[PDB]
Amino acid sequence: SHMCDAFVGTWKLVSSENFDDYMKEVGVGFATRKVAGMAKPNMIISVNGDVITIKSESTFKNTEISFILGQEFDEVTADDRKVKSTITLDGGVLVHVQKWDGKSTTIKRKREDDKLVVECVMKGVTSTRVYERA
Numbered sequence: 001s002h003m004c005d006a007f008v009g010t011w012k013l014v015s016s017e018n019f020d021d022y023m024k025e026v027g028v029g030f031a032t033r034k035v036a037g038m039a040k041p042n043m044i045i046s047v048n049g050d051v052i053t054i055k056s057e058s059t060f061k062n063t064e065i066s067f068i069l070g071q072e073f074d075e076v077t078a079d080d081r082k083v084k085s086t087i088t089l090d091g092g093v094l095v096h097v098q099k100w101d102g103k104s105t106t107i108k109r110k111r112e113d114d115k116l117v118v119e120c121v122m123k124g125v126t127s128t129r130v131y132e133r134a
């Protein structure tokens with residue numbers, strides 16, 4: 001038993017609320033928002049030693065990040081921001097902070113029932129994307 005055992009596995013997107021507005025807050029352009037909005041990505045979470053890997057796969061783009069909890073890393077986002085990212089574990093919840101150009105967004109992943117719930121926040125604006133086991 002470990003840190004992120006309840007996160008590990010293959011997950012598929014089943015619902016999304018307020019995603020377009022979150023993207024607008026983040027600065028995503030029109031064409032990228034429309035493409036992002038169609039996608040039903042799979043999210044593959046694995047653990048090896050202290051290293052967590054999260055891959056996101058979709059028709060558009062496959063991304064992947066590997067990190068250690070608390071250690072800052074360089075990340076290219078799906079919309080092509082170059083950001084400074086730190087992921088930590090806040091008692092059960094994976095808390096992902098992305099910092100760029102004086103701005104900051106926070107993405108929280110938590111297990112609720114059989115769901116992996118992804119909560120995305122920037123300034124006022126919150127989007128909720130719900131995943132289930134593939």
Ligand SMILES: Cc1sc(NC(=O)C2=C(C(=O)O)CCC2)c(-c2nc(C3CC3)no2)c1C
Pocket residue numbers: 022023026028032035036039041043056058059060061077078079107118120129
């Ligand atoms: C095919 C996809 S999927 C996707 N995004 C996601 O799937 C996200 C999450 C998830 O559910 O994993 C949580 C954060 C965004 C984007 C995309 N996102 C963004 C900015 C908001 C970052 N721009 O493009 C695109 C082109």
